[PDB]
Amino acid sequence: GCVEVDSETEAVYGMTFKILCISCKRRSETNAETFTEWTFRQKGTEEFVKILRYENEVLQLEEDERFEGRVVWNGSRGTKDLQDLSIFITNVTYNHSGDYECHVYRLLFFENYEHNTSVVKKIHIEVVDKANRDMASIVSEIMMYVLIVVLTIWLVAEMIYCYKKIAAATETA
Amino acid sequence: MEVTVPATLNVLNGSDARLPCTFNSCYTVNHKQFSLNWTYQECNNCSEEMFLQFRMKIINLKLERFQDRVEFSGNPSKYDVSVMLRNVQPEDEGIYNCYIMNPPDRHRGHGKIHLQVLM
Amino acid sequence: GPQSFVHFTKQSLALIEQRIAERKSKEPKPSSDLEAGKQLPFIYGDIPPGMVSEPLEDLDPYYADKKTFIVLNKGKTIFRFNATPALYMLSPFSPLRRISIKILVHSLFSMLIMCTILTNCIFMTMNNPPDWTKNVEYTFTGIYTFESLVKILARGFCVGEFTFLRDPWNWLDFVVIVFAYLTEFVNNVSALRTFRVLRALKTISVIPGLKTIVGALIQSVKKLSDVMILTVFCLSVFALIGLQLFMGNLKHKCFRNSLENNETLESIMNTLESEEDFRKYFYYLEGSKDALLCGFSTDSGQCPEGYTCVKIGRNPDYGYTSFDTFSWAFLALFRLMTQDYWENLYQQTLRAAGKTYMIFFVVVIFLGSFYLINLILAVVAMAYKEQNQANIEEAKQKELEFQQMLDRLKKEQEPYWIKFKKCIYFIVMDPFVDLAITICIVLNTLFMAMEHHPMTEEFKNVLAIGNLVFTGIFAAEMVLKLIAMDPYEYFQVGWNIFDSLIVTLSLVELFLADVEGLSVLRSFRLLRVFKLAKSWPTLNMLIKIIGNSVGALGNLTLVLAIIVFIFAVVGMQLFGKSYKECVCKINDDCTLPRWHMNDFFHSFLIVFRVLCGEWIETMWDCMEVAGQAMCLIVYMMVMVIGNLVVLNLFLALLLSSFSSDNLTAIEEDPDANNLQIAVTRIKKGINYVKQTLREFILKAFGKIWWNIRKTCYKIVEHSWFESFIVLMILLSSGALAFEDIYIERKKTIKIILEYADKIFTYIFILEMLLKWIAYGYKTYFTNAWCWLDFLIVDVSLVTLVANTLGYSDLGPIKSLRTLRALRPLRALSRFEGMRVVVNALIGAIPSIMNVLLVCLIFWLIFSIMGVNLFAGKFYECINTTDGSRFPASQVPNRSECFALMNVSQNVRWKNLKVNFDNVGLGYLSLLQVATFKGWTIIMYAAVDSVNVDKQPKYEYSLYMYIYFVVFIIFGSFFTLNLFIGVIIDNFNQQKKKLGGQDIFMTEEQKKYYNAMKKLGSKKPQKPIPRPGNKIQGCIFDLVTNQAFDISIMVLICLNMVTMMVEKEGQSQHMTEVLYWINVVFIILFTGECVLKLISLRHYYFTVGWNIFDFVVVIISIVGMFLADLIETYFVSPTLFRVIRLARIGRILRLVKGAKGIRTLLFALMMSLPALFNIGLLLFLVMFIYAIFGMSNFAYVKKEDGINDMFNFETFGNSMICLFQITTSAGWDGLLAPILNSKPPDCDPKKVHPGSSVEGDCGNPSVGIFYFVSYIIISFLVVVNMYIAVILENFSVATEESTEPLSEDDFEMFYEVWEKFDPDATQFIEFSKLSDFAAALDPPLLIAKPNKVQLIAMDLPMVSGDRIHCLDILFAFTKRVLGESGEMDSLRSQMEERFMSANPSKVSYEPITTTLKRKQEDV
Ligand SMILES: CC(C)CCC[C@@H](C)[C@H]1CC[C@H]2[C@@H]3CC=C4C[C@@H](OC(=O)CCC(=O)O)CC[C@]4(C)[C@H]3CC[C@]12C
Ligand SMILES: CC(C)CCC[C@@H](C)[C@H]1CC[C@H]2[C@@H]3CC=C4C[C@@H](OC(=O)CCC(=O)O)CC[C@]4(C)[C@H]3CC[C@]12C
Ligand SMILES: CC(C)CCC[C@@H](C)[C@H]1CC[C@H]2[C@@H]3CC=C4C[C@@H](OC(=O)CCC(=O)O)CC[C@]4(C)[C@H]3CC[C@]12C
Ligand SMILES: *[C@@H]1O[C@H](CO)[C@@H](O[C@@H]2O[C@H](CO)[C@@H](O)[C@H](O)[C@H]2NC(C)=O)[C@H](O)[C@H]1NC(C)=O
Ligand SMILES: *[C@@H]1O[C@H](CO)[C@@H](O[C@@H]2O[C@H](CO)[C@@H](O)[C@H](O)[C@H]2NC(C)=O)[C@H](O)[C@H]1NC(C)=O
Ligand SMILES: NC1=N[C@H](O)[C@H]2[C@H]3O[C@]4(O)O[C@@H]([C@@H](O)[C@@]2(N1)[C@@H]4O)[C@]3(O)CO
Ligand SMILES: *[C@@H]1O[C@H](CO)[C@@H](O)[C@H](O)[C@H]1NC(C)=O
Ligand SMILES: *[C@@H]1O[C@H](CO)[C@@H](O)[C@H](O)[C@H]1NC(C)=O
Ligand SMILES: *[C@@H]1O[C@H](CO)[C@@H](O)[C@H](O)[C@H]1NC(C)=O
Ligand SMILES: *[C@@H]1O[C@H](CO)[C@@H](O)[C@H](O)[C@H]1NC(C)=O
Ligand SMILES: *[C@@H]1O[C@H](CO)[C@@H](O)[C@H](O)[C@H]1NC(C)=O
Ligand SMILES: *[C@@H]1O[C@H](CO)[C@@H](O)[C@H](O)[C@H]1NC(C)=O
């Protein structure tokens, strides 16, 4: 079951990073022959230059010294019906901050019909120096601790209330 | 195949003679496969002359004996393969046959009309 | 007059004549027991041998005056006649007429006709008889003419009253004789031969007892009128709804975008007509005959790229599945009502129009299908029970009448071999030998069961020796008893015959070198456990049921059979040739399909299949080959009549058996059960051994704590605490609906839920701690609910600890994580509704388990037989590309299949994946056959079986269909009877225990139920006062006339007929016309409202029906205005149709007049609360199963039933699939893709982009448990419980004639008491009782003679022949009021209020009663 997820937008310097590009098909049962290009412009420029082309089952890499090496296909394996075009950078540098493009060209096959189709996916990547914990996670954890504490305090309070009243009614009889 | 025709058709000389022929074939009429041959013989033991045929479409053979007086007058999709003989002449008297194949229906149909020309 | 027998003479005839004439000139019911056709009363004793079979004078006095004469047979059978000259030609003494009457009532003559009928029936079933059979046909018609004549030559044609044509049954054979001679001289020949099938019907008028049964069936039908009307009404309303919502939706197809030659859609759609053509433009899904559907919404099915959704072409299923016109919509909804292949229509509709409309199907299935079917069941059961209570009453009262008349007749009359035989007979000890042989046979069976397909030679030979030693023991025990008894003694008990047959078959199969299908008898030997007496009560229940089926209710079974035969032969006569000829319509190879009517056998199979609930698919093919009309007529008749007779038989068996066991009495077995004797013996023995071993072993050798407890106990019972906990439960359960295959996309929510899980765990742990502190362990762990919550929180805590510690993903921990799906179970202890339903279900689990066990043994027999017949015979060498079983001309055996695999590529020698390879898969296949879901595929594989490794051939067996027919008849019919029966007999004991109260309603709901039942009252209020303003008075006296309401009703019917005439793509002109007609109708009814509102000024809102009328007027006007407003300002098709839906309200007013439909709908309204609780429980279970599914089957392959939509991937899709199979529809389709678990079927290394899970194979054990458990739970709840609910609410409603009322007139009782008891001692004499009861006024008046009624009231009597005043008072008030429940409630108050006023108990001791005292006198 193909599920179109989207990539992360922050890579940690000096590490490796997997860019996502998942382009499902409308109907899973049809046959396809997918091939894909990727293009990227380093932040601070306006020109999408090609970097890699994955065709058949062999990846072809351009001579962009930013990506000479350091890049490996991590999409689908030996199928010719790719349906997943993620790539994987190794040894992330600072030059890899910019806008990435994932062109998907897919030729569908029918009874007496062949419809080439195209879909483009755009990704924006920023390289940082230290992995920042996402705001959602920190906010959620803080709210969790807060909820735990407030519920505990409510209970303690209720108990002391009912407890003093119960001790009173105990001493009355 | 049930083919409905009048066994005898009596027509006045000079009038138009519709030779009615319908056939009860359950299968739908596929014009790319349906076959009709309308032949004419003078007697039961005489030679048949094909004068109209539905092969893909209506083919009128324009036999000299009929001049240009033969017309198709049916509708195959409605199971009607009738023909029209305009301005009937005495020499038109004889036997006319409607042959019908409606694939994939197995059986071939045959209607036979004895046309008589009255004064 | 035991000696009143007189030959009909001429002089006596003249006497009768003159007598009737004189009486008429001067100017009662006949004795039904002397009616002709019955048997002569024994009081007449034997007949003189000279009087039998001779014209005798009439015995009945009622006919003694009329002109008649009676003749009796040698079987004491009364035969009335007419003494008028037959055709004014023959006297009752004419020799011709004399011998005519002689032979007509002759035993040989009657039997002759039966044999003729039977052999003619046998002849009818040959599709293409040889020529000579024409002579036999002439023989048949000659015999029929002869028998008809001899009857006319006795009773005359119409010249009298007891005449041939008088009995309607003679009309049949009369018109048969007519056809018999019209058909040969004067001449559609396939439609005339069928008419002779009425000769088959002729059996009903010859077999003794069939006329009675068909009369019973007719009387049962005549009571189904209102239900049929209501069914038509609901189907029509829902059909208008469907016509509004889905009109022209099923025409959607995915049309390709890029077209060549500058062509458009129209230029194409009129130039192609063939499958291979439509496959070039529309998208067809690999092996389908229809184009794939689509939709414009976002939740509809998608088209691939290069294909756009468009509305064109024909509907699916040759065009017979559609909501285009009203007739097709009505057909589709009738199909939804009976749930025949509904799931396919369900899927098609949801694909075209979107998932949301699921709501439509939900309501139709619950409110329509389930409700109307149960209504039919209830009415049929009620009619049957009424008529059968009447019949048993008549039988018993006439047996007492026979006793009375018998008493009236009585009062009017007033060497070494022998001693050795006796030395062996010692060992016939019932509690020893019988037990021993029962044990061995059970072992044998188990040993046989171990049979399975791929077997080593060792296992085989071992089994063989086992069947040798068991045969030996059985034969050995046979001959011993054979000699200790001898034939007269031995051959009287049925089981001795059983065992004899068993050992004979065993030995004959022992010697025979050859193997035969007698293995079946081998397997049957297991029936021996039936010889285990009543001790197992349910097995005796099953055998008694079968006996009643072939015993008491035998005539009904026979009728079903005849009916099936008649329908099979009429179908064969009408449709056979058509199937043979125009075959290439319903098949692509011009070969007969799997189901047809070309010969008698397959026709019978089709009829049997229809009765089993599947009728639509065969009908489609029939409609294609024959004409629509004829086919519809035949199948509709079959459907209705066959299902009616099926329900009658089912309910007869059920009711008879269970209510009789309710009514039966002492049945202690003649012989103490050997088992019981032995068990006492073995229990005594084991206790003795216990005591001896015990003896052998002995001889060989401070306040703060209570404050805390009280406080926390005050906490966990406050309302706030429970409400908060329930809120937490709902939140925690809903948080499970988000973990689907798309959770990875939505990252935030993922993290939020991951964190909230910890909060929920902490809260529930705190709650459990408080529970412990407040209740303590002894109070806590003795609750079921607290145990459940403890287990759930335990698994959550374990998942948590492991996770935090860090060794998560340690194998089984990941599997244990899936138990989070149980968290919803914490809601069962919170909602009182689910609690009561669950309680009832648990209370019933014992009985369920007993009947389940009984079924498991019985199914074991069929499973072993199937293993013997079909083990490993289902393999086939198919072409994997298109799934075609290779022709078997090539590839004859398995060896060649492998050769082709070597040579070719896409061929594969595959099994069936649900088969009879062993007893487990045997059980599974039998379940699929018993639910009729999935069977077809199993059966076809079966009838094609050749041998173990040989390639199957097309219908090489063709007769194993018999095996499946038999298994259905027993294991799916009788067992369902027993199942349903025990669960309804148990749901009545639960009801009885709590004082006859609804076991499915909580307290608040019981109060609401009583208050709502108080609505079906008949309290007449005052009609509105006529206003004084004559300008309003005229309108008033007009609006309240009955003609006004009649005219309004016919207006509503006309509006309905107007709504019906809509259809797909009608016209513009017709559209405008219909619009203006709707406008006119709106104006008219608005008019009635206004007029009412000017006459009934403020009384128009005192009737709920008038409120409904006001509401529908408002709604209709708003709908019209808003519809035109939308049509102008905006554009929205779906919304426009949804808003036009409002005009249906004007149709719902039709129920206001139908005084019979209101009753049934009131019953539904009564039952709504219980259905609500059951629906809650069902929804909870559905929720739980959905979460497991999403956890487990989210990644299985897409094979069948699992498709793009209808998968288990999200929560919506899972709930949809679960709702589908709640009615068990197509559950085999869902199960099939789970069962594959090895390559090349699946791949355990699938990648699944966007997820870390690998593989697409499911776990067969998990899936089997899942689906089997689910359909069993659904059957346990939504079927049985629903039925029970409605089967009681319907009764309650249809009791409406209720209220019994009268006032305290007792003062008149005391005014009369003083004149006979002047001293006010509260006592009177028995002699004075006869006149006191004659001095009271009505209704307590007892007229002369009071004595006969006064003694039947068995008043208690005090010493001195005196009776108390309260005794006679209660006796008289009972006579007017009857045996009511308040009658005993009042007496408790009347006796207590007297005990409080008169403490002198000594003067009240009763010594005798009036009924006893009169027996002392006599
Ligand atoms: C009373 C219960 C228990 C059994 C009822 C059985 C009937 C439903 C069967 C027996 C006779 C059958 C009928 C035999 C003859 C005909 C005539 C047939 O019409 C024609 O043959 C027309 C021929 C022509 O037009 O040339 C349509 C089926 C029908 C009604 C059959 C319908 C099904 C029938 C009525
Ligand atoms: C080790 C600590 C942390 C937890 C201890 C929990 C126990 C106190 C709970 C768990 C199992 C419960 C027991 C489950 C079973 C029984 C048997 C029960 O007795 C019977 O059921 C008799 C039935 C019969 O005689 O037919 C008495 C309660 C008792 C001891 C329960 C007492 C409370 C127990 C021991
Ligand atoms: C932890 C896993 C691996 C095993 C779990 C086993 C439990 C499900 C079994 C063992 C003890 C059984 C319990 C023993 C005692 C009871 C109390 C019983 O209720 C009563 O006896 C009420 C008696 C009364 O009211 O007089 C209900 C069944 C129940 C919960 C049993 C339910 C099934 C239990 C919990
Ligand atoms: C599907 O689309 C791709 C991309 O538009 C096609 O690739 C192009 O091929 C043409 C020659 O036919 C080249 O001139 C372009 O430069 C290619 N574009 C790129 C950037 O790849 C591809 O041929 C199409 N596939 C089919 C089967 O038609
Ligand atoms: C399996 O089925 C396919 C399709 O029905 C077969 O392929 C066909 O082979 C015939 C020759 O026998 C050709 O005329 C067709 O054009 C083929 N069709 C397709 C779609 O390929 C195939 O031969 C079958 N396999 C075997 C072993 O018989
Ligand atoms: N009325 C039916 N209910 C079943 O759900 C249907 C499925 O099962 C069955 O055996 O074959 C197909 C169809 O004919 C069925 N008919 C047969 O039962 C089926 O769609 C796939 O098998
Ligand atoms: C992708 O590439 C990396 C680097 O070679 C490799 O280690 C990893 O296993 C690959 N992952 C997948 C999903 O193929
Ligand atoms: C990345 O590459 C640089 C340049 O060679 C090197 O200094 C550094 O150690 C590398 N880091 C990793 C994690 O491989
Ligand atoms: C990074 O890119 C800059 C140009 O923007 C180039 O001058 C530099 O050499 C690059 N560094 C590496 C390590 O490739
Ligand atoms: C097809 O389109 C062309 C436009 O270039 C037009 O000239 C031609 O007539 C069209 N053919 C038909 C059959 O309409
Ligand atoms: C299979 O069929 C072939 C026919 O060519 C035959 O030779 C062979 O013996 C058969 N297999 C068996 C097991 O008999
Ligand atoms: C064909 O199959 C056999 C095994 O049954 C194998 O030994 C042989 O080498 C195979 N030959 C081919 C053509 O692959």
Question: What are the residue ranges spanned by the domains of chain A?
Answer: 1-173
CA-wise closest residue to C1390 among C1368, C1409, C1366: C1366
A14 CB under 6 A from ligand 8?
Answer: yes
**Cα–Cα distance for residue pair A76/A58, rounded to 1 Å:** 11
- Residue pair B57/B77 in contact (Cβ under 8 Å)? The answer is no
CA of C1257 to the centre of ligand 5 (A): 29
**Cα–Cα distance for residue pair C1242/C1256, rounded to 1 Å:** 6
Q: How remote is the C-alpha of C395 from its chain's centroid?
A: 29
Token pair 């007029």 is at which residue? Answer: C1091
**Cα–Cα distance for residue pair C1350/C1410, rounded to 1 Å:** 8
In 10 A of CB A145, how many CB atoms?
12
As a whole number of Å, the CA-based R_g of chain A is 27
Residues from A in contact with C at Cβ < 8 Å: 1-6, 22, 24-30, 76-77, 83-84, 108, 110-113, 115, 117, 134, 136-137, 140-141, 143-144, 147-148, 151, 155, 158-159, 162-163, 166-167, 170
Token pair 């000659």 is at which residue? Answer: C142
Q: Tell me if chain C has a CB within 8 Å of the CB of B28.
A: yes
Q: Tell me if chain C has a CB within 8 Å of the CB of B27.
A: yes
CA angle B71, B74, B79 (to 5 degrees): 150
**Cα–Cα distance for residue pair A47/C1136, rounded to 1 Å:** 50
Q: In A, which residues are within 8 Å of C303 by CB distance? A: 26-27
Q: How remote is the C-alpha of C466 from its chain's centroid?
A: 43
CB contact under 8 A, B26 and C581: yes
Q: Which amino acid is at C782?
A: T
Q: In A, which residues are within 8 Å of C1209 by CB distance? A: 1
Sheet of strand B17-19, all strands in order from the earlier edge strand to the far edge:
B17-19, B83-85, B70-72
Number of domain units in chain B: 1
> Which residue among C902, C904, C909 has the greatest number of ligand 12 atoms within 8 angstroms of its CB, and so is best to mutate?
C902
Closest in C273, C590, C625 to B104, CB measured = C590
Q: Which amino acid is at C730?
A: L
Residues of the domain holding C598: 553-658
DSSP E strands, A48-164: 49-55, 58-61, 71-73, 87-89, 98-109, 114-128
Q: Is the CA virtual torsion C581, C585, C590, C596 positive or negative?
A: negative
Cβ-based neighbours of C150, under 8 Å, separated by 6 or more: C100, C103, C104, C109
DSSP E strands, C1010-1125: none
Phi/psi zone of residue C305: left (φ > 0), alpha (ψ -120 to 50 degrees), beta?
A: beta
Residues of the domain holding B60: 1-119
Tokens for C20? 């009737």
> Which residue of chain C is at minimal alpha-carbon distance from B106?
C581
Buried b (16+ CB within 10 A) or exposed e, C256-270: beeeeeeeeeeebee
**Cα–Cα distance for residue pair C1133/C644, rounded to 1 Å:** 43
As a whole number of Å, the CA-based R_g of chain B is 14
- Residue pair C943/C961 in contact (Cβ under 8 Å)? The answer is yes
Buried b (16+ CB within 10 A) or exposed e, C294-322: bbeeeebbbbbbbbebbbebebbbeebbb
Q: Which ligand sits nearest to residue A94's alpha carbon?
A: 9
Q: Tell me if chain B has a CB within 8 Å of the CB of C272.
A: no
Token pair 């309680």 is at which residue? Answer: C839
The residue contributing the CA closest to ligand 6 atom 12 is C934
**Cα–Cα distance for residue pair C87/C151, rounded to 1 Å:** 13
Closest Cα in chain A, distance from residue C928 (Å): 29
> Which residue among A91, A92, A95 has the greatest number of ligand 8 atoms within 8 angstroms of its CB, and so is best to mutate?
A91
CA of C430 to the centre of ligand 9 (A): 102
H or E element in which residue C58 lies: none
Tokens for C626? 């024959």
CB contact under 8 A, C585 and B26: yes
C188 CB under 6 A from ligand 1?
Answer: yes
- Residue pair C864/C451 in contact (Cβ under 8 Å)? The answer is yes
Cβ-based neighbours of C497, under 8 Å, separated by 6 or more: C491
CB contact under 8 A, A1 and C256: no
CB contact under 8 A, C273 and B26: no
Instruction: Give the position, in ligand 11's atom list, of the atom nearest the Cα of C949.
Output: 13
Q: Which amino acid is at C1344?
A: K
CA-wise closest residue to C1086 among C1117, C1059, C1057: C1117
Residue C1356: beta bridge partners?
C1409
Strands C1406-1409 and C1356-1358: antiparallel
Q: What is the 3-state secondary structure (H, E, C) of C481-528?
A: HHHHHHHHHHCCCHHHHHHHHHHHHHHHHHHCCCCCCCHHHHHHHHHH
First to last CA, chain A: 70
**Cα–Cα distance for residue pair C595/C609, rounded to 1 Å:** 10
**Cα–Cα distance for residue pair C548/C501, rounded to 1 Å:** 24
Strands C1362-1364 and B109-118: unpaired
Token pair 């027996």 is at which residue? Answer: C1415
Resolution (angstroms) equals 3.0
Q: Which ligand sits nearest to residue C896's alpha carbon?
A: 11
Q: Tell me if chain B has a CB within 8 Å of the CB of C582.
A: yes
Backbone angles phi, psi at A103, to 5 degrees: -80, 130
- Give which of B1, B24, B25, B26 to mutate to test C binding, by max C Cβ within 10 Å: B26
In 10 A of CB C569, how many CB atoms?
21
Instruction: Please give the method by which this entry was determined.
Output: cryo-EM
Phi/psi zone of residue C339: left (φ > 0), alpha (ψ -120 to 50 degrees), beta?
A: left
CB contact under 8 A, B30 and C585: no
CA of C936 to the centre of ligand 6 (A): 7
Backbone angles phi, psi at C1168, to 5 degrees: -50, -45
Integer angstrom CA distances of residue C1142 from A27, C378, C566, C1111, C1393:
37, 33, 48, 11, 62
Closest in C752, C759, C1204 to A147, CB measured = C759
Closest Cα in chain C, distance from residue B107 (Å): 10
CA-wise closest residue to C1300 among C1392, C1202, C1378: C1378
Instruction: Give the position, in ligand 9's atom list, of the atom nearest the Cα of A42.
Output: 5
Give, to the nearest 10 degrees, the angle between helix C975-993 and helix C845-870: 170
CB contact under 8 A, A76 and C1247: yes
Instruction: Please tell me the total number of residues recorded for chain A in this structure.
Output: 173
In this complex, the chains that touch C, judged by 3 or more CB pairs closer than 8 A, are A, B
Q: In C, which residues are within 8 Å of B26 by CB distance? A: 578, 581-582, 585, 625
Q: Which ligand sits nearest to residue A127's alpha carbon?
A: 9
